Structure formats: C-alpha cells, structure tokens
C-alpha cells in the first residue's frame, strides 16, 4: 500500500510539474528557457 501510494503520488507530481511547465511556457514565453533547464535540474 505504501509503495502504491508512492507510485501514485510520483505520477501525480510528474503530471503537476509537466502541466505547470507547459502553462508557464505558454503565458510566459520569455521564461521558457529556464523552465526546461528546471526539468534538467530535476530530471
């Protein structure tokens, strides 16, 4: 149960930050370049 919770929360967080990066790129193109680096800083 703990492992399933960990996997589900990891998937949720991944989709969270993917959507947030996408929208930050969308409405703020000038900050698009660091955001991808942020992914490189995280992933």
């Amino acid at each position: 149960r703990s492992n399933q919770y960990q996997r589900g929360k990891m998937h949720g967080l991944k989709q969270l930050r993917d959507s947030l990066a996408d929208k930050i790129v969308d409405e703020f193109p000038e900050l698009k370049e660091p955001v991808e680096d942020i992914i490189k800083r995280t992933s």
């Binding site: 991944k14 930050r17 990066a21 930050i24 000038e30 900050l31 942020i38 992914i39 800083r41 995280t42």
Partner: protein, 169 residues
Amino acid sequence: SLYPPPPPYVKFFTQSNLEKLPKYKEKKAASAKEEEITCALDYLIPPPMPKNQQYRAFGSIWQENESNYQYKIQELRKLLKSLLLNYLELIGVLSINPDMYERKVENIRTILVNIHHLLNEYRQSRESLIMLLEEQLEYKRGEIREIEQVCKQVHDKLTSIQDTLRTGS
C-alpha cells in the same frame, strides 16, 4: 507592587518652590554667566536636549513642500518572475527529490524578504497626503459649485418674477 512608585523629585517641588522659581532661575543664569543636582530647584529648569539627538528605550533607538522609480518597478517585475520560476523549480524538487527541498525553500523566502526590502524604500505617507488632498479638494469644489448653482437659480427665479410683475403692470 503592580504600580511603580512616583518619581522622587515630584515630592520636592511645593507651591513655595514654584513661586520662588523665577528668582532662582535668574540667580542661576547670573551665576552661569550631566547637570549636577546642587539644589532642590534644579529640576524645574527645562532639561537640555541631548547633543546626539537620540533616545534609547526598551533596547530600541530613536532619533518640505508638503507642509529612477522605473528601475525599482522593473526590478520588482523581474523579481516576481524569478520568484514564480523558483517556486516552479522548488515544487519540482518536492516532486523528484524532496529530501533536499528545504535547500531551496529559504532561498525563495530570501527573494520574498528582498521584496519587503523593496517595499521599505517605496514607503506612502506622501501618497496618503495626496489622496486626502484630492478628496477634500473635490468635496469643496462640489460644495462651491452647488452654491453658485443655487444662488444663480434663485436669481433667475427673481428675474422671472420681475418680468411677470412687469407684464401685469
């Protein structure tokens, strides 16, 4: 006790001391031509302002026509953008490797703290003076304008009545 005792010098000054104060200060000024307490009447003499123009209390210190701001604006905008970017990066840290998340958290707070510093130089009393200025100015203009409006309408009514009575003559 709950209430601290009155100051000690308070009890030294009777009515006789008050009435003899003028001659005492005259004698003191004649002689003069931290203050030592050589006489009981010294306290009524106004205390001198400290040369440093400073006052300490409870561990804290204390001491004209109203009687590049664009740089600060753009700094605030770039700081807000960087704060949003750092919030995104920190939540990504929480997502992937939260164990070291605090390593960024306080960092973000520093920027927020810097924002508070950016408010300190922008401090607003003059702006409050301005806003009060225009509100009473417009209020008095409204009062004035309604005054001439009402007196003019009364004068117009009087002229109309004068014409009416002249026609009835």
